[PDB]
């Protein structure tokens, strides 16, 4: 995987995947170097179809594939989502790492389940008002710079929004079923918005501007919480989180070794990321971490158990 000369010159679709193909369910097109999509009309059966990493400018010719389920594009030189309108059994589109800059020509896709635009340019969330079926959406490593129009998807479990612009959390309130929130390398200062979801049981909050453990209350099934990489200096209203597993707190300000007393109500609480606080000048650090939290097995990158 190291450097390819032929990478940026289009082939012709492969004769013999296609023809190995015909009648297969699965079709592997992955790293052929396919500019143009043309000639698939002679996949009749097909449900899985993975056309990643290769050098596709423009989605076409799809459209005779109606037994279609799955469709990878992923790596890819898309710039526009088009003609994806008559593919209506579709359950999984993946065109993450694409050049689109929105997101369109889903609207007709009312199946969909999981639906990811992994590392684009889209700039706004839009145009996903009638997917009602959609359970994950992963939007991370674009420019989305609100939390928007997503109040009528109320069967995700799960929303990748990391790595942004997004300056605020809200909009949020409608999807009681999110069960995994990721916002992080994002724009906030403030934890909010959460009340509403009660299921949620991973929150990855790392790399933004917080400065203050807060609005959480509500949210008593997390297992997962990741406040790392933020301005915290005391660990606060947590105490009432007794399902806690796993804990980044690392990469903060965090002084008191008084602030752990409000983890003791985890038992379950089995790793927890204390590095690069101020706690760790102090030589005792492992210590006083076991000592405080005797459920923990695991304390950074070091395996303690106990």
């Known amino acids: 995987g190291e450097e390819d000369p032929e990478e940026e010159h289009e082939l012709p679709v492969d ?13 592997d097109l992955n790293h052929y ?21 290769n050098l596709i400018k423009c989605i076409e010719n799809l459209e005779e594939l109606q037994s279609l389920r799955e469709l990878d594009l992923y790596d890819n030189q898309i710039k ?31 199946r969909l389940k999981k639906l990811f635009l992994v590392n684009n340019k889209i700039s706004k969330i839009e145009n996903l008002s ?11 490593s674009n420019r989305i710079r609100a939390i928007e129009n997503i109040d009528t998807l109320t069967n995700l479990e799960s929303l990748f929004l990391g790595k942004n612009k997004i ?15 990721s916002m992080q ?15 949620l049981r991973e929150l990855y909050l790392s790399h933004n501007g917080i400065e203050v453990i807060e609005g959480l209350e509500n949210n008593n099934k997390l297992t997962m919480l990741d406040i ?11 105490s009432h989180l007794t399902e806690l597993q796993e804990f980044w707190m690392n990469d903060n300000l965090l002084e008191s070794w008084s602030d752990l007393d409000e983890l003791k109500g985890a038992r379950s609480l089995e790793t927890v ?34």
């Open 228 to 238: 790392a990489s933020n301005r915290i200096k005391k660990i606060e209203n947590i």
């Open 167 to 181: 300056t605020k959390l809200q909009n949020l309130d409608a999807l009681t079923n999110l069960t995994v929130l």
């Open 273 to 306: 990321y204390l590095e690069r606080n101020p706690l760790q000048k102090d030589p005792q650090y492992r210590r006083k971490v076991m000592l405080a939290l005797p459920s923990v097995r695991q304390i950074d990158a070091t395996f303690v158990r106990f």
């Open 185 to 199: 390398s994002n724009r906030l200062t403030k934890i909010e918005g959460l009340q509403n979801l009660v299921n």
């Open 15 to 27: 004769m013999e995947t296609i023809n190995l193909d015909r009648d297969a369910e699965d079709v």
């Open 130 to 140: 009638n997917l009602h079926q959609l359970q994950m959406l992963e939007l991370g």
């Open 80 to 110: 526009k989502i088009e003609n994806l309108e008559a593919l209506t059994e579709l359950e999984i589109l993946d065109i993450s790492f694409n050049l689109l800059r929105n997101i369109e020509g889903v609207d007709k896709l009312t």
């Open 33 to 53: 170097r396919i500019g143009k999509i043309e000639g698939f009309e002679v996949l009749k059966k097909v449900k899985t179809l993975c056309l990643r990493q």
